[model samples]
Target: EQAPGTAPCSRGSSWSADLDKCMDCASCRARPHSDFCLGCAAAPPAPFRLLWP
Candidate 1:
């Protein structure tokens, strides 16, 4: 069971709802460099590169 206020994949699971499958990303990898999902990456709010570093 998950704790309160915690989202699925918050603990680094290689699952992406956007792709509807498990794969690599910041959330999946638990890296603080990027916070956006794969879907967001497809249409990028800001520069996609900005999410890193």
Candidate 2:
């Protein structure tokens, strides 16, 4: 789902000047990156080969 803005940040995140980068602006912090942020962590593209597929 696309957000309504001429310029948009990544999914589940918003632009934060304080971080000088995109971060979880949503109050819930639902996605999970740092304790202060979510959806900001780097995740693997898919399941790891060593892990259960």
Candidate 3:
């Protein structure tokens, strides 16, 4: 598992980071080794829930 707020380095072919935007629709569950949302979005770990709760 990756540290929260940190993106993984290896994004799969289905994912791409272009113009500062993520160009893939792949989910986090699909690629555990890769960053969530191809480094565009942070890894999902209930960040909101953790802070709000």
Highest TM-score scorer: 2
lDDT value, residue 30 of candidate 3: 54
Please report, in order, the local distance difference test score of every candidate based on alpha carbons: 0.43, 0.47, 0.42
TM-score of each: 0.21, 0.24, 0.20
lDDT (10s digit) by residue, model 2, range 1-53: 47543234556665555556654445433544443343344442556466853
Model 1 stretches with alpha carbons more than 4 Å out? 1-13, 24-53
Cα lDDT tens digits, model 1, 1-53, are 55433345444434555445543344423344333344334443457456646
Candidates in descending lDDT order: 2, 1, 3
Q: Tens-digit lDDT track for model 3 on 1-53?
A: 55344233345423443343233334554554443255534542455455643
Each model's backbone clash number = 0, 0, 0
* All candidates: CA RMSD (Å): 8.9, 10.6, 11.7
Which predicted model would earn the best lDDT? Answer: 2
Model 2 whole-model lDDT (C-alpha atoms): 0.47
Model 2 spans with C-alpha error above 4 angstroms = 1-9, 25-53
